[PDB]
Design a protein around this nucleic acid. Structure first.
Ligand SMILES: [Cl-]
Ligand SMILES: [Cl-]
Ligand SMILES: [Cl-]
Ligand SMILES: [Mn+2]
Ligand SMILES: [Mn+2]
Ligand SMILES: [Mn+2]
Ligand SMILES: [Mn+2]
Ligand SMILES: [Mn+2]
Ligand SMILES: [Mn+2]
Ligand SMILES: [Mn+2]
Ligand SMILES: [Mn+2]
Ligand SMILES: [Mn+2]
Ligand SMILES: [Mn+2]
Ligand SMILES: [Mn+2]
Ligand SMILES: [Mn+2]
Ligand SMILES: [Mn+2]
Ligand SMILES: [Mn+2]
Lengths: 79, 99, 105, 94, 97, 106, 86, 99
DNA sequence: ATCAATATCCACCTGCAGATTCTACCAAAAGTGTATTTGGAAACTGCTCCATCAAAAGGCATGTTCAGCTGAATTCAGCTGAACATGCCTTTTGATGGAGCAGTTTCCAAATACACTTTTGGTAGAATCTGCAGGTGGATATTGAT
DNA sequence: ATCAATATCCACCTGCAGATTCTACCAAAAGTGTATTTGGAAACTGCTCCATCAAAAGGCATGTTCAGCTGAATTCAGCTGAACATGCCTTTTGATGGAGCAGTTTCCAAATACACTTTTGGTAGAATCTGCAGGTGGATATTGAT
């Protein structure tokens, strides 16, 4: 399916930026889990903002507001 | 002569490379599908601003990189250099994320 | 004939910031000095970051501030960092930092 | 219509601290999000502060206390300075 | 000397307390806590609602605003039931006048 | 005639007062008719949800009056209430009994 | 007439009380280095809360820190406290 | 003939005791002095509502017990049953308190 | 540490495309000059609530002894995770067009805000009630030694 | 597989401190009747947005080989828990002076409410520039071997 599209090398790359040197093979599937939970929660909140605005298209502000209200403020798309 | 760098060297090399860089590290389309799949579980017929899909990837990669940081610290804490799922889990609990 | 921003010696728009205060459901009446004072604070912080970022830019031999410069500017400063501890700068990246035990030799 | 920014002011400020440097557009927006953000924290805390004291008015005093509560100490001090300064100057002009 | 009434949510919490446990009473520190819980959640909703009105350039907070608010703030199930109750409370309040 | 809005909505919580608190709270300029009703309802629902759970705790713990400990047991044992109040500290609440397995003897 | 001079009071956080707290945390064995470490953390924690609470006090033109000042203080610090006013 | 609970037995006993419990664990007055000291170093001539001093204690003991939980998890993570300052520091670094 | 040989990096230059800066204009904000409002700062002052102070009592904090069991130091083999070259295919990306919609306008009926004028519901102490906090003494586990 | 030593539970009791009920004003709901707004409900734009298309290109999936790391097993000094003797200072209970909230009145400096009158900041084409992305050719780093 689509999570699996979050490839092991890309997972390995993110880890690298994190300063990670050695990666257990079990990490990748664990990581895919976290990422899907992360995304779900953000998107759920985003679409709610969408639905509130009587729209059918998620805007970048919908994502921002969502992130902002979840404790993860994002600069660069706001306004 | 066939030639091999010792284990953990290209890793260090990779680290210095990616910490120096700023680019998104998950590929844009696989991610975009992932976004759109998940989203239609909440409402149907949804369109996405390009900026909106992008904002998300920035946030996700920010989140995950941060998480691998705190994870690698738990790996170190256990006298290891290999991140394991215990480590990701300990981080997520202390972050309060789902304890 | 003469604007409140220049009247306070500011670049930031004391004018707009007063309208935004009124129109933001903060309190029923907004004070005369509050938009000046606030505009003053916002400019200071802007300047504070921006110089630090410009310094970051020249050090990578560049003349234009990109996000990385802003991210470098912020996370290398103990106080701006505390202020934006919860903020993500898109296209910012992270500070080069590698735990010691991971170095070889 | 017109979607307004803090861009031209951010730029003006960019030049008087650094006349050398220009600013990437995606970077310019980052800064714009920074200004609107901090704007909101201060204004929100300021609102609250007036409530705690059953006041109907947000004054420079409320903005100040706010700034002492949001900003870290060195940053807080300097901002209070600059803020007091702009106010006293704008008082004294007319 | 003539204390300016400090009003509470106490009597209502008590009423509802009785509707579920006609059995049980409540300690005053416990009552106070509950009283702090109601005011808290009031503010969270009312705030989020405030923002929602701002994003849609609306000057008015409607039961519709509170609802989106409640969906964002509450967890599932608490959200689902809480929506129902509000929706029910509202149309019943309509239907009377 | 006297009819109150609270009763007009079938609620215990005071729709009137909650309409005023909205108007007076710098949330928006105009407040809609249903907003205080819908909110009084939601505040009322949650009060009950917590209170029933707490009452069980008081009874499970032999007692007739709910104290803070009880509200804490009620909240920290309900996965959803617990998430709602993740950042909340209940004075005199204590903590849920929990001892890591690796710590017990055998 | 004059006030008494307060000092070294973080030692009032006795080792028994630090242990008691760890127990409620579900701690079985405690290194001797913990107690002085804890005192550090507690003081930072406490300072920051008192700094803000007192800031609310002076803003309200008062000389007495009210329980509401601590509550607001705790709140804007991420730690909402039920039991003392809202 | 003299009788001794084995090491670690009274600890488990003590845990079960204090977790079952709800009372403040720091002495009332020693803590109040601490409060009046710290406060006074920030401003002089301060008075405190008895409730305000209590509110602070309630928060502080809440905080420290919370902190000791996460600490104890890093200890276990490191294959220990003894909390160390290193563990408190990992907890706080990840809590983001001061990383 | 030298001795040598793949690969990795780093510098200095270089041509151009993608953006960035610079220029030329107009509704909508901002600044003004009045006419009022109005909040809240000052000036008493009735009164909770804090700060001391004292005096007596045991609940605990301190400090010492002492040995059990934990943490740390060491060793080592099995095997997991890194590096590497191959072979393949999914992602990129570049228009190209059609259409779904955000984003704006133009009214109006519905809903809300006012301004007063009554009508209760809540609240603040007094007046009663009643959990349960503490204190005992025997049954039931739990724990640790022969 | 047992008993001796403590700690844990559970019931049953009894007066008070804290909860509940009872009464009585007042701030605040509620009921009416004008006097505004506003949030949509339709008609239509221009625009970003999905859907393909069609190659090309790196980026990914596999499999092989093995370095080196994680986990296991053992060992031991010495740290930290359990227990005890001592007496300190915290906790309790009561009283008192007065500092400082809190509550009302009184009244201007300050803010709002208009009504116009400027001015600025936004938008769409216009006009240089800064890096990116490659290109050598020069030391560096990493690794295999006397
Ligand atoms: Cl002002
Ligand atoms: Cl009544
Ligand atoms: Cl001009
Ligand atoms: Mn029931
Ligand atoms: Mn004994
Ligand atoms: Mn060179
Ligand atoms: Mn024109
Ligand atoms: Mn002693
Ligand atoms: Mn061990
Ligand atoms: Mn009545
Ligand atoms: Mn008892
Ligand atoms: Mn040792
Ligand atoms: Mn202009
Ligand atoms: Mn280059
Ligand atoms: Mn280059
Ligand atoms: Mn080359
Ligand atoms: Mn070899």
């Amino acid at each position: 399916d689509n999570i699996q599209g979050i490839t092991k090398p890309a997972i390995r790359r993110l880890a690298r930026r994190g300063g990670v040197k050695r990666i257990s093979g079990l990490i990748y599937e664990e990581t895919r889990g976290v990422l899907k939970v992360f995304l779900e929660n953000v998107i759920r909140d985003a679409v709610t903002y969408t639905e509130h605005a009587k729209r059918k298209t998620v805007t970048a502000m919908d994502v921002v507001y969502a992130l902002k209200r979840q404790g993860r403020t994002l600069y660069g798309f706001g306004g | 002569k066939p030639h091999r760098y010792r284990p953990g060297t290209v890793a260090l090399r990779e680290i210095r490379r990616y910490q120096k860089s700023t680019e998104l590290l998950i590929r844009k389309l696989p991610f975009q599908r992932l976004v759109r799949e998940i989203a239609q579980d909440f409402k149907t017929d949804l369109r996405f601003q390009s900026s909106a899909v992008m904002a998300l990837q920035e946030a996700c990669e920010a989140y995950l990189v941060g998480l691998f940081e705190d994870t690698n610290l738990c790996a170190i804490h256990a006298k290891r250099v290999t991140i394991m799922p215990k480590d990701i889990q300990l981080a997520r609990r202390i972050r309060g994320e789902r304890a | 004939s003469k604007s409140r921003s220049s009247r306070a010696g500011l670049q930031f728009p004391v004018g707009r910031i007063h309208r935004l205060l009124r129109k933001g459901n903060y309190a029923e009446r907004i004070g005369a000095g509050a938009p000046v004072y606030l505009a003053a604070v916002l400019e200071y912080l802007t300047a504070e970051i921006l110089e630090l970022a410009g310094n970051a830019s020249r050090d990578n031999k560049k003349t234009r501030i990109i996000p990385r410069h802003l991210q470098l500017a912020i996370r290398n400063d103990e106080e701006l960092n505390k202020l934006l501890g919860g903020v993500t700068i898109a296209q910012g990246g992270v500070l080069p930092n590698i735990q010691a035990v991971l170095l070889p030799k | 219509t017109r979607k307004e920014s803090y861009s031209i002011y951010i730029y003006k400020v960019l030049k008087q601290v650094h006349p050398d440097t220009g600013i990437s557009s995606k970077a310019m927006s980052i800064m714009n999000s920074f200004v609107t953000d901090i704007f909101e924290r201060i204004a929100s805390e300021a609102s609250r502060l007036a409530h705690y004291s059953k006041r109907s008015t947000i004054s420079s005093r409320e903005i100040q206390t706010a700034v002492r509560l949001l900003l870290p100490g060195e940053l807080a001090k300097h901002a209070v300075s600059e803020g007091t300064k702009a106010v006293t100057k704008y008082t004294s002009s007319k």
